[PDB]
Design a protein around this ligand. Structure first.
Ligand SMILES: CC(C)c1cnn2c(NCc3ccccc3)cc(N[C@@H]3CCNC3)nc12
Lengths: 286, 279, 65
């Protein structure tokens, strides 16, 4: 073929990824719906913080996608114990993620699978959202989605309550969880089930009421929980300034409508405050 | 979004001459391939256009009776797939009957209209082994269709722009007291616009606006102040004249469109089956 | 270095679309279906559908191939 295959990089439920010459190839229902989703979405998107689809090809019902090859992802950086995550590094990662998400939401697409392993880093320190196999277009009044999206540790409470219709809040909550993981170096809300995920959410952030979530009882899978006080944000994040705590609170608001959008998050004082985001070439490489 | 879409950048063409050039190139390239493999058996490009129109209405009929109900966006995507495929391919190499079903199948996948292959092929009015053979051919041609579309699968239809224009008219244009009575007729014009090559020549917003304005003209309401004042084209005379002549070209395209004739498509169908009998 | 927010500069080749939070103030939302309580609970508002419809209606209206 046109690509000189070099090295195995991993395997998935839909395709296997290999590095080739530098690019990465992800190789009676017909062509896989997830691959078609990735193709159709990444052909219409072009932003420095979104993974670029360079080429696509295949044979019969089998198909392969060509992407730019990425060095690492946020999961490896977080799990690396020799990588000190300074506030500037965290701000840089958050800024790139939010700019990619702002571009994606502008074009009315929800990633719906945001997590540290889906935020890839290249050799130039540029963060790109990847794994668009769950991404979907939003804003239509009839495209009923499923609440079984987003990995559980990063799933928003409205999804865990069975929200069919939702907006950018599902991505914003995952962004908040990624920020919490960046600050704590461990998953913020590591549930073992949907009920345990909701229990951890309410134990850490307090059980929301109608003050903070006016229509929470209308969600089909809503279940009344015990009233927890919630650990205050400055307790959880003892090394976070007031601006970062404000950003975290905005990202973790229980009301999806009141939850800050990518644009509003980017306009927050945290990103414009000292210190500035670390330049991509200076970010740490695991 | 359309303004940075693949439909605008790669599949919106400047003139009908460009489309005719592409179709003639496809027909001549197939003729060269066939004579290299080895003449009244060959089809002329106008005959190919007539057959493509016949099978586009066949695709419309298939999508209209499809259970579960096909969303109109899926039908638009499938028809655009058909048009794009036969811009650069000949019906004598790839039979339009299979290609239209492959277009519907790919559109159902792309527009997230989750439908199983058995229930897709059950809509076909064939025998169980006939439907199975049709499914086999669709799976054979799905990758070919995707490759010929150059992996550009998102199709921007005029329906959402039409709804947005109706919202804008209801909000910012009180002179037209009820934009809703402009709907059905405009939709009719929309369908007529879909029959021509306008989808490959103009933006979906322009198509929707042209349909709405033709509907307004039919009802006798002349409301050029919507373009002049509400969309503020009185601040840009060049843009206003450009929009007006685009819509006039749309209406000319619709008026000069010719439906295929039954005896003509019969003869061309015999010729097409003869071409697909052997090479 | 600092960081300063700059809005994304994407040419739409069409009429200006009013901002999302202004739609209700401008009377647009009175012509779109109201979101159900479940819709608001999940984060879906009628403003989203209205804004998307307007953006598609105005995208590339002045563009020539
Ligand atoms: C866009 C995508 C096809 C892609 C681009 N780069 N890339 C790499 N690069 C090596 C690497 C990246 C991150 C951490 C460590 C190592 C690996 C990889 N494989 C995983 C295995 C199951 N799917 C994902 N997928 C990709």
């Amino acid at each position: 073929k046109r690509y000189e295959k070099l090295d195995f990089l991993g395997e998935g439920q839909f395709a296997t990824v290999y590095k080739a010459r530098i690019v990465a190839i992800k190789k009676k229902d017909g062509i896989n719906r997830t691959a078609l989703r990735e193709i159709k979405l990444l052909q219409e998107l072009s932003h420095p913080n979104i993974i670029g689809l360079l080429d696509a090809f295949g044979h019969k019902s089998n198909i392969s996608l060509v992407f730019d090859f990425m060095e690492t992802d946020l999961e490896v950086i977080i799990k690396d114990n020799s990588l000190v995550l300074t506030p500037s590094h965290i701000k840089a990662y958050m800024l790139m993620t939010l700019q990619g998400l702002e571009y994606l939401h502008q074009h009315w697409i929800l990633h719906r699978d945001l997590k540290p392993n889906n935020l890839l880093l290249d050799e130039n320190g540029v963060l790109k959202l990847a794994d668009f196999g769950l991404a979907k277009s939003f804003g239509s009044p009839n495209r009923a989605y499923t609440h079984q999206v987003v990995t559980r540790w990063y799933r928003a409470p409205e999804l865990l309550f069975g929200a069919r219709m939702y907006g950018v809040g599902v991505d914003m909550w995952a962004v908040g969880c990624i920020l919490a993981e960046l600050l704590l170096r461990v998953p913020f809300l590591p549930g073992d089930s949907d009920l345990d995920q909701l229990t951890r959410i309410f134990e850490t952030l307090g059980t929301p009421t109608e003050e903070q979530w006016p229509d929470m009882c209308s969600l089909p899978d809503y279940v009344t929980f015990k009233s927890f006080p919630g650990i205050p944000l400055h307790h959880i994040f003892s090394a976070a300034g007031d601006d970062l705590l404000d950003l975290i609170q905005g990202l973790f608001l229980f009301n999806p409508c009141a939850r800050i959008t990518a644009t509003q998050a980017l306009k927050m004082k945290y990103f414009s405050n000292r210190p500035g985001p670390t330049p991509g070439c200076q970010l740490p490489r695991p | 979004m359309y303004h940075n879409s693949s439909q605008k950048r790669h599949w919106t063409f400047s003139s009908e001459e460009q489309l005719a050039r592409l179709r003639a190139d496809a027909n001549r390239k197939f003729r060269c391939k066939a004579v290299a493999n080895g003449d009244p058996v060959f089809l002329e490009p106008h005959e190919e256009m007539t057959l493509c129109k016949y099978y586009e209405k066949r695709l419309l009929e298939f999508c209209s009776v499809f259970k579960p109900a096909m969303p109109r966006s899926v039908v638009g995507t499938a028809c655009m797939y058909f048009k794009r495929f036969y811009l650069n391919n000949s019906v004598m190499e790839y039979h339009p009957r299979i290609i239209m079903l492959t277009c519907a199948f790919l559109a159902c996948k792309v527009d997230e209209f989750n439908v199983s292959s058995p229930q897709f092929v059950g809509n076909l009015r064939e025998s169980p082994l006939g439907q199975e053979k049709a499914l086999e051919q669709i799976l054979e041609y799905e990758l070919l269709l995707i490759q010929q579309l150059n992996f550009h699968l998102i199709v921007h239809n005029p329906y959402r722009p039409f709804e947005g224009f109706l919202i804008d008219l209801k909000t910012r244009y009180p002179i037209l007291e009820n934009p809703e009575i402009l709907r059905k007729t405009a939709d009719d014009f929309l369908n007529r616009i879909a029959l021509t090559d306008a989808y490959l020549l103009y933006t979906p917003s322009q198509i929707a606006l042209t349909a709405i304005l033709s509907s307004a003209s039919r009802a006798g309401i002349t409301m050029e102040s919507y373009l002049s004042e509400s969309l503020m084209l009185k601040e840009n005379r060049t843009c206003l004249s450009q929009l007006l002549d685009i819509m006039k070209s749309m209406r000319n395209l619709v008026k000069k469109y010719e439906p295929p004739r039954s005896e003509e498509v019969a003869v061309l169908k015999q010729k097409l089956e003869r071409c697909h009998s052997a090479e | 270095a600092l960081y300063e927010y700059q809005p994304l500069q994407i040419e739409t080749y069409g009429p200006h679309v009013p901002e999302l939070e202004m739609l209700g103030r401008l009377g647009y939302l009175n012509h779109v279906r109201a979101a159900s309580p479940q819709d608001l609970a999940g984060g879906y508002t009628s403003s989203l559908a209205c804004h998307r419809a307007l953006q598609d209606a105005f995208s590339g209206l002045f563009w020539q191939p």
